[PDB]
């Protein structure tokens, strides 16, 4: 499920996951209110609107769900 727009990411959210959007930042958290996903506008070092992905323990993931520290900054 990698190639989505932001609108379908927010619309296909899993079961129990809620989300909130404010000033162009989206926070999505799972049923445990754990932050799992964030969409952000560009900052100084990332110059593109990106997705952030986070496991059950808030670790950065890449497209493949593998834990990462670059690859953590996922276009959509």
């Amino acid at each position: 499920f990698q190639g989505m727009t932001k609108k379908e990411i927010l619309e296909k959210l899993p079961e129990g996951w809620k989300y909130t959007e404010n000033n162009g930042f989206v926070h999505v958290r799972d049923a445990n209110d754990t932050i799992r996903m964030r969409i952000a506008p560009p900052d100084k070092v990332t110059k593109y609107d990106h997705v952030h992905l986070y496991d059950e323990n808030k670790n950065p993931l890449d497209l493949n769900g593998n834990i990462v520290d670059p690859d953590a900054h996922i276009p959509y």
Partner: protein
Amino acid sequence: VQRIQEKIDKLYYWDAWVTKLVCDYFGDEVILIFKDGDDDVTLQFSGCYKIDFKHSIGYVKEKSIKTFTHEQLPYFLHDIEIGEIEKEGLKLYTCKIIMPPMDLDIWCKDIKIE
């Protein structure tokens, strides 16, 4: 002004999780701790004369933050911006922090990373 400002940029703080934000001692002192890998970067603002924290009303807190786990904390750093101002002949550093979902502005006398 700018020595500290790009000394901050050399921390590579962008998108880092913030683990603690404390304003203590009658607003004299602000402590911000964010995680660099597994370690703690401390930002310390001392000699403060203005502390202005604004939390987004769109992000409703359903429990007191103190009862959040770090797993539940949303706060992360998006931009730290340093500046300089003078009010009635007092020169003060300013720092504006976009750490969604809140906005912070500090007029302080020193900024030091620990």
